[PDB]
Amino acid sequence: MEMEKEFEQIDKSGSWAAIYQDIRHEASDFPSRVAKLPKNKNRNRYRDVSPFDHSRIKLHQEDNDYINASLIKMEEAQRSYILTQGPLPNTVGHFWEMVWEQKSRGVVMLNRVMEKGSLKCAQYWPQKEEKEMIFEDTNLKLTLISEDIKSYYTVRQLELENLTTQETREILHFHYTTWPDFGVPESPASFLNFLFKVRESGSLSPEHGPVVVHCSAGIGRSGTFCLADTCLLLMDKRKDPSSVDIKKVLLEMRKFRMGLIQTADQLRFSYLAVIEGAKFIMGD
């Protein structure tokens, strides 16, 4: 069923909450035993949001290999993403260790450091060229190279150095700065523009490791970003684009991380973004 007609049907009948709860009922449940060990309590921002054991990202250290991060592997679309929580004061070094070890080119950030008067993630990148950051627990150095501030997002060029080997790499930071404190955006136009800028950079392409994407918990806004990207790529690839079923794609992604798409409003926004984005994918 053409999603656009499905959309009007749900909107006229006002049943978004019912659709969304069906997804929650049918979603996968896999163990997350490593996340819940006592030694990891200060590595989790929220007690109810954990990576599944089967898909979690492991840090390459014998000490403690745990980080709240999951690998979402989309087999038909041929895309992979790492979804993670906003880093905590005690996990900023782990975060950059994971970016290094997984060979990522880009980091996608969908929240502000402070929202609703409270801190939603650590200030984990440097704000001035001449004031670099050193993460002593993981032996990395991070330097701001350049910054391009636009009305709806900011793109930063960063240099990450492995201090053990003195290798360096360029990381691109894509920061969407205008998601509202409450609700979802009224139009998906600026979010789609942002997604296409990430794509154009190479950060989503198979020559690099998976993109790292986060918000505060790494399931809500972050889920919207990967769901829309994968659905639009499948509409590109298939003989019949109307065959793409966004609810089924979302349930597949939920095999790899719990809780993706947090509200019925985020579900509706995801439909809207894919519907409007398709009016480029089919040739404009």
Side-chain angles (χ1 to χ4, degrees):
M1 190 184 196
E2 161 65 338
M3 45 184 330
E4 187 158 27
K5 319 295 168 45
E6 217 211 311
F7 181 91
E8 319 257 32
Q9 204 261 303
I10 309 206
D11 231 11
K12 93 182 184 307
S13 37
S15 36
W16 282 109
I19 311 300
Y20 180 65
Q21 203 66 31
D22 293 346
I23 289 162
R24 298 193 37 171
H25 173 258
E26 279 307 281
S28 298
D29 187 28
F30 293 113
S32 311
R33 278 161 211 139
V34 181
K36 290 325 217 142
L37 294 173
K39 67 176 192 168
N40 291 326
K41 179 175 216 342
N42 73 345
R43 294 187 178 210
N44 294 308
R45 177 174 294 280
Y46 302 106
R47 318 262 59 70
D48 60 331
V49 181
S50 308
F52 299 141
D53 296 318
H54 79 89
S55 53
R56 72 182 184 96
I57 300 293
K58 300 180 187 178
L59 304 175
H60 298 178
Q61 48 156 309
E62 320 181 278
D63 186 31
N64 182 346
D65 67 10
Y66 178 75
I67 179 171
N68 193 317
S70 313
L71 179 63
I72 288 50
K73 288 191 307 293
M74 299 308 282
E75 179 197 356
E76 184 187 357
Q78 285 296 287
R79 280 273 220 257
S80 294
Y81 320 81
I82 292 167
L83 267 67
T84 191
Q85 69 186 14
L88 293 156
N90 289 298
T91 68
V92 294
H94 308 150
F95 179 89
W96 286 113
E97 175 187 1
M98 169 176 66
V99 168
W100 184 267
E101 285 167 0
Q102 303 295 316
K103 297 180 161 55
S104 308
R105 178 76 191 320
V107 173
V108 172
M109 177 170 175
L110 302 173
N111 67 289
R112 291 165 304 282
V113 164
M114 176 166 282
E115 298 180 7
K116 290 150 146 199
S118 308
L119 296 175
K120 295 304 174 192
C121 91
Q123 179 64 49
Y124 67 86
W125 72 96
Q127 300 190 274
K128 282 154 155 142
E129 285 88 340
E130 67 273 17
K131 297 292 219 177
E132 74 275 13
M133 292 168 78
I134 293 181
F135 305 99
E136 286 190 59
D137 57 331
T138 56
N139 213 226
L140 290 154
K141 181 176 74 172
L142 187 64
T143 304
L144 177 69
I145 299 303
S146 74
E147 194 166 37
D148 193 342
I149 299 176
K150 268 86 163 133
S151 47
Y152 279 97
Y153 73 99
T154 298
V155 54
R156 306 181 179 93
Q157 290 191 317
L158 307 175
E159 177 194 281
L160 189 60
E161 184 181 341
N162 181 333
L163 290 173
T164 291
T165 68
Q166 305 191 139
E167 312 155 71
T168 63
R169 288 177 204 160
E170 178 172 275
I171 307 301
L172 302 176
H173 194 244
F174 291 91
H175 187 183
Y176 190 81
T177 53
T178 54
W179 195 293
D181 268 9
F182 290 93
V184 308
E186 188 170 288
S187 157
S190 64
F191 187 72
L192 289 166
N193 190 61
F194 175 75
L195 165 63
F196 299 148
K197 295 293 207 223
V198 180
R199 279 184 171 198
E200 285 179 3
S201 83
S203 289
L204 288 167
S205 299
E207 314 104 59
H208 302 291
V211 72
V212 171
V213 352
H214 79 87
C215 47
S216 193
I219 60 174
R221 300 176 198 171
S222 291
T224 304
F225 182 89
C226 66
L227 179 60
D229 182 53
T230 285
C231 282
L232 290 166
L233 217 38
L234 290 168
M235 282 163 90
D236 253 358
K237 213 165 129 85
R238 291 181 176 175
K239 214 180 303 301
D240 178 13
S242 45
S243 80
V244 170
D245 185 340
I246 178 173
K247 295 191 262 63
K248 294 175 190 323
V249 177
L250 176 53
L251 286 163
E252 178 68 27
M253 296 191 153
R254 282 201 172 205
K255 297 173 183 177
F256 299 94
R257 184 168 177 87
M258 64 168 64
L260 305 179
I261 310 296
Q262 279 179 294
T263 68
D265 264 282
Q266 278 174 8
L267 186 63
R268 182 180 187 274
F269 181 77
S270 296
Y271 273 73
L272 263 169
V274 174
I275 292 162
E276 295 298 317
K279 313 176 189 288
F280 169 79
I281 297 333
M282 180 142 251
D284 189 344

